[PDB]
Amino acid sequence: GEDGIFLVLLGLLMALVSWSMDYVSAKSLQAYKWSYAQMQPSLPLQFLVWVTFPLVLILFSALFCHLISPQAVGSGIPEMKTILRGVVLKEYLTMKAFVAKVVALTAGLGSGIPVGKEGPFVHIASICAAVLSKFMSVFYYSDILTVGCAVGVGCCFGTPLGGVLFSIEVTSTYFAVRNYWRGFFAATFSAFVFRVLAVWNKDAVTITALFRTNFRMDFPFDLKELPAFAAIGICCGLLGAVFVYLHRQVMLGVRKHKALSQFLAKHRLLYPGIVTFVIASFTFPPGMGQFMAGELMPREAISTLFDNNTWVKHAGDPESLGQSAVWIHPRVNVVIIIFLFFVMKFWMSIVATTMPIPCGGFMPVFVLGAAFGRLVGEIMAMLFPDGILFDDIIYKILPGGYAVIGAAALTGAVSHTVSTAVICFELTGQIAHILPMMVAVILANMVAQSLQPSLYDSIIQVKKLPYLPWNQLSKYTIFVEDIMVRDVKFVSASYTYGELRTLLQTTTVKTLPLVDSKDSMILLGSVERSELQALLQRHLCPERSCCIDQSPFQLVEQTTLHKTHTLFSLLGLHLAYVTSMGKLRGVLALEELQKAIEG
Amino acid sequence: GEDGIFLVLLGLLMALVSWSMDYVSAKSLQAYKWSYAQMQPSLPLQFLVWVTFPLVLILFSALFCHLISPQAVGSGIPEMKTILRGVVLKEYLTMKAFVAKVVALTAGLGSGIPVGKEGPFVHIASICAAVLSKFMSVFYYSDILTVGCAVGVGCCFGTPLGGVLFSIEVTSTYFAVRNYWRGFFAATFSAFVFRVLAVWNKDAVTITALFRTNFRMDFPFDLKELPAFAAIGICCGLLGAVFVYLHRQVMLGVRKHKALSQFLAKHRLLYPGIVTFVIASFTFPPGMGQFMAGELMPREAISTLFDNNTWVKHAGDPESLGQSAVWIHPRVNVVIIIFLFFVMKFWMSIVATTMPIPCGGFMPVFVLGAAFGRLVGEIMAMLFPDGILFDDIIYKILPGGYAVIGAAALTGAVSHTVSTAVICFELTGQIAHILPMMVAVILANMVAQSLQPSLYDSIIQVKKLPYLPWNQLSKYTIFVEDIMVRDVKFVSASYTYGELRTLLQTTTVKTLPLVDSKDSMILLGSVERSELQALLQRHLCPERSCCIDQSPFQLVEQTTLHKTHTLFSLLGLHLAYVTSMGKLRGVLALEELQKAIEG
């Protein structure tokens, strides 16, 4: 209702910020290609501009990473999915980092270097959620986190129900359907504003999603190449697994040597730009885009992969097609150039997300999946040139559907979900290939689940962040006896005047255990300290409402750590007062469960 | 994995049963229309066959409702959403009722009377889930219920992600994402088999969903009729609310009078068939389908409503169109016939779901929504005959999109969800109108949420079933003091030989509280009775492993009933041992919370 009105201002602001950032990104990008073309074709000088614009934007982005942001480097979803699991970092929710991130992420987005988008966008979306929650409802924690995640991804791509599925499907154990309704209304209004604002200020005609991919939708697949879809499940998951593995292969290489550690403490600025430099050394179009089509910034690149005609048959013609004219070298077969494009983007993207940058883990993987898909689609077009017959209509296959289903499959495989297929068909604009892409997505997901861990789980493992995982293993003897803390603070109601002044002057924490007597030791309830301070001081001044809430839990003192973890998971709660016979004996905290489950 | 293999046999069987039932339904239906046409046009005799086939099939269905099924009359989802909230009815999960229902539901489906499909299909899906869970994993309760719900609706309509959203979005408070993954894999394989089996035995070409609705997808909406979409939100929700209200207006009329109660105990068979009779009295095409198009069985009827051309402009021509030729009376404007169709199906469908029949609450409502949508689409086509201009292309509007978005909207409004829009676009086959249908669905949902209760909540209210609801009301003084049961059974470990033989001969229940001493009164844990029986008897025979699990909960004796309800909700648990100082004092059961929250 009126919390819906809170949500509708949230989505309005979030869509204004997203349109702003990709608008300025696209304008900087067209200015880049524009001046690059229009100065002169000078093979020293076009090389000079091809180097000197992307490295200076990435240096600018990394400067904003360094100076203003003390902790927001490498931002994304896994730290906040650890936050909603409990490990709170309020200083990491600073508004000041917010503006410090986003424009650098615009510099990240405006670069021709492959970056993701969604991750730090989800982070700033949860930032705006928390700040507006501070600003409204004065004029529930993981609820605002969850809704911020939903609004962030649905405001990236205009994909509401993919937004809410990408919000639920990993970042929880249980989930309240209230927040489902909240985030679904939020995500649909954020998606709605993002597209109509386009048709307002700029040209957009009507409301296409982003990428109208005009397929024939008349005898689409058929069911003869369908086991080929089986291959594009399993193989993608295979290679996708390797991707995550190789990311660990460089993150350990990030922090294995004292030599580069010493030189990075010596000079932090040196590391990103230079390898940006060297991948630009393989990107320059009359250098290597003769074999790479290096004049493909990724958005229009993947729009060119969704071309609804066979490029091998159009390798037979010299026709000026659309942007797919970049996909012709006049001597080299185009399967080779697609293969080289795929493998070279593949090893560049891990290096791209390696550097100390706010990096989303979705977009270049999505590009790689589209690459592999149109690869196998074009070779199946070469494999069956004949097509089939139908009533006065010869129907040959077309590789655009293969491209979009593989671009679902492989990033779903890396990301360990199925909600990626949802935003995949929602950005493709037609839902012909819906059940085969769901099949292939789940095939790749179970292969990936079998082989290698998640992307973000490997990220928090390597970054060594406090987080409770589990792998369904309850062995013989795990008991909470080396763990509980026997330091107990205590308040009684039958404590009088001097004792209560002493409690003011000796204690500091936010809420306090109330018992009957310290000799009885039995925990009874809990009272906020500051309300007691209020009652004492605002009775002291006029000189010259006591409600008792109950402790919802109690820990039987031989509980196995799996079941203890399960208890805090299903309660969604932090701490444990460990008693026998009510008499308080120990205290178990969250970080000690992590230190326990180290083994 | 191999529980996935459990799931894949489940979905294979479920899709075989669904294809079987609608195959036989369609064959009986085409035989009905076939013999009806081909005997002769005799206005007494065609009236005779028009009566005598539907009432005899409905009598047959009601006979199967009566004799074999003792409790499965009026089956659907709200009893099982009460079961997964706790109120178990194992006798209502009888396999014998299963075959006793489905063929009568086939008789329900094969009738020309408007029935739903999904509800009892969900019920038999959860039946097959439970039975296969008994059969596999010898060769977790609400998990199998939830997955059965998902498989049931996704096996109805071939709509997997709509299946899992319709499984979650009402039938829970919290939800495990494990079951999300389970049911998503299950739902996609059930949807997958349903369509490929079509292309195997019968003709199907390739894999369309059901209803390819060929729209132009080129300048689709535009954003000038978009506030008209606002109307088709709110108005539908308005009228949809009235629908649920009028259902109560007849269900009380079901059980208000002792006269019809006496005559129904006198003769139960009389009630359904005769009103079937009288709505057939308004269905006969040269009687009233001259103004109704009564020769429209509902599936091809709604396919005819998704006609991508303006029937008012084709009221200008005498052209033999497709089945839409039934939409012409040569003297009466077709807006009038659509209006009369809508209002007459509207008051017939509540009477149709009234009778003691397994009735789904989705399909005729979906028909009514499509009716209202094409109504307003045709009058907007009459309102703007000109259309707009674009580059050498004059584009006029078309009412098929209005029909499909209203057919989302109104049944989403009745059903109190948003997942209905998902299965709506997934059966339409194109996703042009995706964000406006989401907007209109949520508009109608908040109007319906504002005005009138849910369909199924009104159903369980009137049928007076034990179920804990809540309406966010925690007043001044609600306390658990008139409620707890002070009858306590007790077991000690230091009880010896004669006492343990006495415990065998005096007690009966499945698991038992273990304490230290009955004088101490403190609850310590719980042990299964039958394992103790096993240890005693299978030690007694060789004459001539004692594990202690802990009680996870304890009730502070002044807990408010809202927070008690909240405790059992978030635990998902049944009972409460109510102690002070560990010493057991009372027992609180589930039905007493319902008897409490009566006020």
Numbering used by the authors:
A (entry chain A), B (entry chain B): 115 to 253, 262 to 591, 595 to 669, 818 to 872
From the paper:
The first identified human member, ClC-1, is essential for maintaining the permeability of Cl− across the plasma membrane of skeletal muscle fibers, gCl, accounting for approximately 80% of the resting membrane conductance and assuring precise neuronal control of muscle contraction. Despite distinct roles as passively conducting Cl− channels and stoichiometrically coupled secondary active Cl−/H+ antiporters, members of the CLC family share a common homodimeric core architecture, with each subunit harboring an independent ion translocation pathway. In addition, the complex gating processes that regulate CLC channel activity remain elusive, with only a single available structure of a channel member, namely, that of bovine ClC-K. Each CLC monomer has a gate that operates independently from the other (also known as “protopore” or “fast gate”), structurally attributed to a specific glutamate, “GluGATE”. Here, we have determined structures of full-length human ClC-1 using single-particle cryo-electron microscopy (cryo-EM), exploiting a purified protein sample that displays Cl−-dependent single-channel–derived ion conductance.
For structural characterization, sample in the presence of 100 mM Cl− at pH 7.5 and in the absence of nucleotides or antibodies was initially employed. Assessment of the 3 major cryo-EM maps obtained in our structural classification reveals different arrangements of the CBS domains, suggesting intrinsic domain flexibility at pH 7.5. Therefore, the CBS arrangements seem to correlate with slow gating, being rigid at low pH in the presence of nucleotides and more flexible at higher pH in the absence of nucleotides, bringing to mind a mechanism that has been proposed based on electrophysiological data. The complete effects of such putative rearrangements are, however, not demonstrated experimentally by our structures, because they remain closed also at the higher pH (determined from particles in detergent environment).
